[PDB]
Nucleic acid binder design. Structure first.
Length: 48
DNA sequence: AGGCCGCTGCTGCTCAAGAGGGGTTCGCGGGACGGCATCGGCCAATTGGCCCGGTGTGTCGCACGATCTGG
């Protein structure tokens, strides 16, 4: 239903192909910086 | 009433059923082709026989004869 209503503006998939597409367009440096900032500031189980 | 800080239970990982149609294989034969393999001659060639013809040098078969040891 959602695809036929608004098929444009996004893409979805199934199986290992979706994970491959995600891993291809993944910014490691930004996520690492976010994790380091949270570690510096955050506390609790979130830090672990 | 949502976010969040712990508890507490639960789970997981590891050490001891036919029928037709068609291209392809191979498998027998099947013989044809070409080839190399096998058998009377054959004469004038190196080695090795097989000797003449000379002596000599050196072993062996026996004669005269001296020395020596045993009999």
């Amino acid at each position: 239903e959602l695809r036929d209503r608004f098929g444009t503006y996004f893409d979805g998939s199934m199986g290992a192909a979706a994970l491959q597409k995600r891993l291809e367009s993944f910014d490691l440096e930004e996520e690492a910086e976010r994790l380091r900032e949270i570690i510096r500031t955050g506390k609790g189980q979130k830090k672990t």
